[PDB]
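Example 3.
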Amino acid sequence: APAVDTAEQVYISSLALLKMLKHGRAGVPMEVMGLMLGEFVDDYTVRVIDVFAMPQSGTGVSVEAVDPVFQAKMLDMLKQTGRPEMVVGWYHSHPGFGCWLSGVDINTQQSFEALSERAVAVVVDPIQSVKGKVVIDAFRLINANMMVLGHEPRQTTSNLGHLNKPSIQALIHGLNRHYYSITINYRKNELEQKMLLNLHKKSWMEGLTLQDYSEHCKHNESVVKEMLELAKNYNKAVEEEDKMTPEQLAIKNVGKQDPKRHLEEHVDVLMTSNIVQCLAAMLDTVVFK
Amino acid sequence: AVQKVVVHPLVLLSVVDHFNRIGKVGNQKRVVGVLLGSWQKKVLDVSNSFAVPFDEDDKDDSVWFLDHDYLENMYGMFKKVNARERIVGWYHTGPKLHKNDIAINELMKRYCPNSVLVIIDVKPKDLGLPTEAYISVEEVHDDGTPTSKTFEHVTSEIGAEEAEEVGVEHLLRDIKDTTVGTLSQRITNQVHGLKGLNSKLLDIRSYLEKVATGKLPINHQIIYQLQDVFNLLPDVSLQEFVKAFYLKTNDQMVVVYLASLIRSVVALHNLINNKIANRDAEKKEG
Amino acid sequence: EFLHAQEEVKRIQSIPLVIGQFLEAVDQNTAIVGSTTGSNYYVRILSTIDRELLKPNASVALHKHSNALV
Amino acid sequence: GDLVGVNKDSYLILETLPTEYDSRVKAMEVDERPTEQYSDIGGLDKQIQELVEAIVLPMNHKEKFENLGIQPPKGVLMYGPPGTGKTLLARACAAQTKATFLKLAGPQLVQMFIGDGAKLVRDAFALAKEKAPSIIFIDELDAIGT
Amino acid sequence: IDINDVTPNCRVALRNDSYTLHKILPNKVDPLVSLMMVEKVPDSTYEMIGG
Ligand SMILES: Nc1ncnc2c1ncn2[C@@H]1O[C@H](COP(=O)(O)OP(=O)(O)OP(=O)(O)O)[C@@H](O)[C@H]1O
Ligand SMILES: [Mg+2]
Ligand SMILES: [Zn+2]
């Protein structure tokens, strides 16, 4: 009895994640879908390299949405460019709903699984995955005939609880009962991170620009005024030094206030801004004549 | 004219994929593709791309083939997937332009008149900005010189729309620098700037040497612009500025001094509070 | 990590943000704010937020999806 | 004002939806004016002749009405203590003057379904424009006249 | 949670998705009938009340 060891990973290339997130936000009010191109490198790893959007259609995210003419032609044309990958799965967004598969989605997944027993299905909520977090869980139908044996039929391994724990907002929509998640791991490699690092990279000119002194003097004057009032409290807070259980005094007056947090916290800002500005000032005086 | 060609992160991450697709087996030079994107007032937005079978020969530098039907059919599919994209130019990862660029650009002019070619130096990972955007202009060169095709330059800048931005930020998530900067990173921002300004000035010197040694044609234009930069220098030695610099340097030191003192009194107060803490616990142990 | 951590927390106060009224307080780092949506929600309180500006009518902002006082 | 069909998610107008004045609206075109012949309404004569001056006559002999310049008042409110028979002479001008008589009693124009009576109103005049000389009669106008 | 603590008219909090009770929460007093509770004692003392 073959089994998807929990160690099994669905490798998502740096390309796919941007393209899958892009498609999801493209039609965010509605639901988008497309086939994912990859290889079943072995039992314990389902590698997805590229994804190509299957055009939005009124059916929604269902078997019917998979236009055989569009897919047969697109695959044929991607084979010439140098991407002879096989259809490894399908993905569809879920405008804010979560990372779960509904009844209709399950029927799709069962279809894809018909062609290969490892066709992984993913989600990609473009509304929740709005910050550093990317809500994209992979899923493979756990055939209902394996209720006699162990669901999530894993074997020797120990990465089942790692990288995630069963999310509650999904466990309710059928997990370890009809669909199980597969650990998602991104195959970012050098020569791809470096090109993405340019997204917010500054430039040579930056770092030598001296800020502007009119708002710098105002800023220096502003912060020094604010720190001054914070010293007044520091004097009152210390000069009080009330000893009625001072260890308890230091814990009954914690509100992110005078003593230190609004203290030198500003010193670092004030001193970092000046030192960098000054050093820029003197470097320019040397470099530029 | 196109003021800017903002290349989204996804394109340079598909081109990298496109270079790897082929170079891995069919070792070859630049990989050519089509660049889709939405227009703006004047800033062309590059939002996606795809590959086009392109084969070239080092002989005659005009035995090439950029497939037409593949370009036509591909876009036929993509306008179905997303309709805000129109063909807007091409990309090739060969760092140095070829003699075939003009002729091929004329082709892509058949699909978008204001076609901009964006050279993505996929192989290099260096000072930065791995995109260089070019247009096609045919002018009489005002100043009495032969006419020709030539590629004019258009300012390139790499930006990100919201969706790709979220993916990219997580995609690094292991080498991203703190946005606050802090003293450590701010200073490195300047050793980095000095290295560039030298590097840019050294490219200028080599070219000036080339024109000086004749190996290159005196542009007669942009050549004196470099002369413009050479007059825009500050001349700091001026007394009236020398006084005004010490005042602001002195204006700041009195703030770093006040900053320094506060951090010192806080330091001593923290040792006195701590000296009491361990001592009091010292006696209290008995 | 600390600077990333603060930045990541600072990301929680990103825009968009639903608006709700600070009905009451249950304890430190928690709240009973009631969203403008029409439903009252038991949410969490961001530490950086000041428990002195949470007056029991305050029109505080709640995270759109996670719906937590931010 | 057009009632179009739009996508439940995108909210893009897909298809203009025909009105056809629903079915109720055309139902209020009762053709069985009970024949409240002015021999059946009594005592209210000067009232009877007066409406025949502002209706029937204005609608029937409009050619002379056009030359005179005497614009015939489009409406006439029927006020008076209950039991005077206002709905009755109304039929009298309704029946013994022909016309279509789309009676739209105000009480019916109170529907808890948002934007229905208003649609019933604009349509009623819309249903009114389609047909030949008629009278749009609204009884108990207090129901929406409040 | 011990069910003995769930008296009628409590203000338990229910989880976001599975609707399970997981806290009793402070009891609900109308927003206007709660400002009526003196939180700040005034500053008029008996020694200022003569006669
Ligand atoms: N002039 C009349 N001759 C004969 N019957 C009359 C006359 N006026 C009213 N009636 C009778 O009075 C009754 C009331 O009908 P109708 O609805 O017309 O009264 P109404 O005064 O219009 O009522 P309301 O003003 O409360 O709507 C009917 O039986 C009607 O025939
Ligand atoms: Mg009546
Ligand atoms: Zn779905």
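Chain E has no helices and no strands. The interface with chain C takes residues 13, 23, 25-26, 31, 34-35 of chain E (CB under 8 Å).
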